[PDB]
Structure formats: C-alpha cells, structure tokens
C-alpha cells in the first residue's frame, strides 16, 4: 500500500559504495512529505524533477540505491562528475531524473580504532557506465609484470578501506547516501502520490 521508504533510509545496515545496494520499489503510493520534510539531511538535491511537485508526480518504476561514502565525496554523486567514486564506483547519467539525499552517520558507522568494514574502489582500468556495479577483487596490473594473484611489485589489491574514526573532520566522516531514480518507462505507471 505504501512505498518502503522508511525501510530504505532507517536501516540497521548500509552497504559499501562499491557494492551499493539497489532496491526496486513499485506498485505503491508514495508520500514524499516524510522524505522531503525530514531533519538532518546534509545534502538533498533533485535534478530531473522539482521536489515541490515531486509528491504529485507519477512514474513507471523507482529505484533506491543506498551506500556509504566520505564527507568530501558527497559532491561527486551529482551527474557529470569525476573522481575515484564517480568513475570507479557509482555513476549517474546526465539525463538523471531523481534525487540524491545524504546525512551524517558518524555515530553509527565509525568505530574507535578504525572502521575497516567500509570500502571503496580505488583502482580500475576503465570508467564504468551509469548504474553499473563491480564487486570483483581481481588485482589491478600496473604494467609489464602480470600480477597473477600476487600483490606488490606494481600490483595492488583494488579496494581501499575508508577507515572511519570518531575523531575525524566532517569531510573525512562517513555519510549515508540514498539515490532515488525514476525509471519512467514506456509501460503502465504504478507509483505516485
């Protein structure tokens, strides 16, 4: 009857940015007042459609992508951006229809001594296309020597750990990101206000 927005935001567990979870939501009336009019949203930008008129819009299908990144990396999530996240981890098209919402999660996702349970992809031989996710651990071969599963010697494991700690500046603190995409396919519409 209602879209499970509460399940998506207020969840006990959040995935790392490289293995970003996607949940397809469909056949549910959506109340966007709670999402739009909620406290502690460090970032909330909608590109395709207006948040004012968001509540009365109607789409075929809506996807909720959710993951965790650093504070300095929240700016990269926008369309047509570049970085080690926008290129090797999570990419949005320039025809983006939807919203990006983020909030400060320093209490939940930062353990004293370092949270090494949250990772991102550092090295990769090609930008991925939008909405594509690579979970592989194949070693990045930087040059002549074939890696062959052995790291070092111009060969590294391709994922780095964020390493959150409580005593970190806001920019180096973890943030919880939820990206909402409106598929608007050539089919019967199923979700709206």
């Amino acid at each position, epitope marked *: 009857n209602l879209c499970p927005f509460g399940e998506v935001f207020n969840a006990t567990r959040f995935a790392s940015v490289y293995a970003w979870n*996607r*949940k397809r939501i469909s056949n549910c009336v959506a109340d966007y007042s709670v999402l739009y009019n909620s406290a502690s949203f460090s970032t909330f930008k909608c590109y395709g459609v207006s948040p004012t008129k968001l509540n009365d819009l109607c789409f075929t299908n809506v*996807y909720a992508d959710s993951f965790v990144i650093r504070g300095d990396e929240v700016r990269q999530i926008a369309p047509g951006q570049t970085g080690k996240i926008a290129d090797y981890n999570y990419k949005l098209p320039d*025809d983006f229809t939807g919203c990006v919402i983020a909030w400060n999660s320093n209490n939940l996702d930062s353990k004293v001594g370092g949270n090494y349970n949250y990772l991102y992809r550092l090295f990769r031989k*090609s930008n991925l*296309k939008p*909405f*594509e*996710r690579d979970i592989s651990t194949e070693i990045y071969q930087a040059g002549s020597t074939p890696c062959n599963g052995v790291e070092g010697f111009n060969c590294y494991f391709p994922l780095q750990s964020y390493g959150f700690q409580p005593t970190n500046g806001v920019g180096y603190q973890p943030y919880r990101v939820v990206v909402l995409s409106f*598929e608007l396919l050539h089919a019967p519409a199923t979700v709206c206000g």
Partner: single-chain antibody, 236 residues
Framework: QVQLQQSGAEVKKPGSSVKVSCKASGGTFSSYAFSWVRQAPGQGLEWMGRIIPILGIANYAQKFQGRVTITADISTSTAYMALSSLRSEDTAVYYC????????????????????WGQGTTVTVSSSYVLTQPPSVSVSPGQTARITCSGD??????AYWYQQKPGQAPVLVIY???ERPSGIPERFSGSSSGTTVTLTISGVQAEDEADYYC???????????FGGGTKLTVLS
C-alpha cells in the same frame, strides 16, 4: 565453454505461429541470460528480445508489439522464443545467443552482451534510436582499418562487436566498449571517445574479411539496437 543447439528448420503459412528452442549444454543455466536475433535474408542483424530465466524477466523490441513472447525452462535448460501472426517479412534466420549477465541478491541486474551464439534456425513463410555505422570500408592487406559506430546513447551504454563471416553465425570479438575475449587474437582492439566508438585491427589479414555489427542498448537500456552493418573487405 558452453554450446547451444537450436531446433531444426520450420515452414509455416502467413498467420501461423513458430516455436524455436535452443538447448544450452554446459555451465549452469540459472547463471546465464538469453536473447534472440533475427537475420533477414541478405540483410543485417535484428534483435527481438532477451530474458533472464532465474528472475523470469523478459523484454521485447517495440516493433514486435505482442507477437513475440520469450520464455525458458530451467528444468530442461532450454530457451523458447515464439512468434505469432507470421508474415512474409518475418522470413529470416533466427539466432539464439547467450547474454553474459550480472544478477544481484538485491534487485539489481546488468545485461552486458552476447558472447555465444547458436548454429541458427531458418524459418520460411510466404503466400527510433539507431547506431550509424559506415556501410563499407576497404583497407590494404598490410595496413590497419578503423570502423566507427555513432549513437547519442554511447556514454550511457556499452558497445559490442560481432564478426559475421558469410554463411556463418556471428562471433563476438570485442566487448564492453574495449575488451579482449580469450578467443579473438591480439590484433583486435577497441576504443570509445564521447559518442564515438571504433574497432581497430592491427595489420589486417585477409582472414579478417567479414561484416561487422556494433550492438548497444537504448538510452534507457531497455532495448538493444544493432548497427546497419559494415563490410570490411581487404583490397588486394
């Protein structure tokens, strides 16, 4: 290393219905996804629809409104494509090819491109987004040839190249914009810049003389599309 043996040839009158079935032997069926391409006689490759069996998700090209329906039986490890309201224009060879896919434990799937093709099934009956591909390029037997492929959705989606020698099923030689399959030799190379992709053949042989088609999906990624085609013949 998985093979596909599609069913035998069929003949029907206009208005009939044809079922074509390609058994896939080897590997694990639930891991793969399948799609269907038809080759009009003497004309380019044409995609109809794909299916992901383990999720039971299938989408078809918009030109076949409801005539075609794709299904599969994981129990039998076969894929069924069924066409109805047959017409003469439907006369073609129908290929069934394995799409290498990625399926997530959350509702995520990304389709990629067709790596393994079936022998083929010839069926006879009688009674808005495009990839722009140069129709034909010729090149000298020691030189290098560059074939382009241009659509406005190419930053959003990947591109794949298939080599169709005459009287042959297509063979994937370049995938994911610029990747090298284990089979195709080192001379084949790919590259993408903006809304332009090129296929590169180093020191082209006379072996490498065939039609080449670039396949990529819609901006939405819902429909795949094929290039008009390119005849590379190496001039003597």
């Amino acid at each position: 290393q998985v093979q596909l043996q599609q069913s035998g040839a069929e003949v029907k009158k206009p208005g009939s219905s044809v079922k074509v079935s390609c058994k896939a032997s080897g590997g694990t069926f639930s891991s793969y996804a399948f799609s269907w391409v038809r080759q009009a006689p003497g004309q380019g490759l044409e995609w109809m629809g794909r299916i992901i069996p383990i999720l039971g998700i299938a989408n078809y090209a918009q030109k076949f409104q409801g005539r075609v329906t794709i299904t599969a039986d994981i129990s039998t490890s076969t894929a069924y494509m069924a066409l109805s309201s047959l017409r003469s224009e439907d006369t073609a060879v129908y290929y069934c090819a394995k799409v290498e896919v990625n399926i997530g434990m959350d509702d995520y799937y990304y389709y990629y491109g067709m790596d393994v093709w079936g022998q083929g099934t010839t069926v006879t009956v009688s009674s808005s987004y495009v990839l722009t591909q140069p129709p034909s390029v010729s090149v000298s037997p020691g030189q290098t040839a560059r074939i382009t492929c241009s659509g406005d959705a190419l930053p959003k989606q990947y591109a794949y190249w298939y080599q169709q020698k005459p009287g042959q099923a297509p063979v994937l030689v370049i995938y994911k914009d610029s990747e090298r399959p284990s089979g195709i030799p080192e001379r084949f190379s790919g590259s993408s810049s903006g809304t332009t992709v090129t296929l590169t053949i180093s020191g082209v042989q006379a072996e490498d003389e065939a039609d080449y088609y670039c396949q990529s999906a819609d901006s939405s990624g819902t429909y795949v599309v094929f290039g008009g085609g390119t005849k590379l013949t190496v001039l003597s």
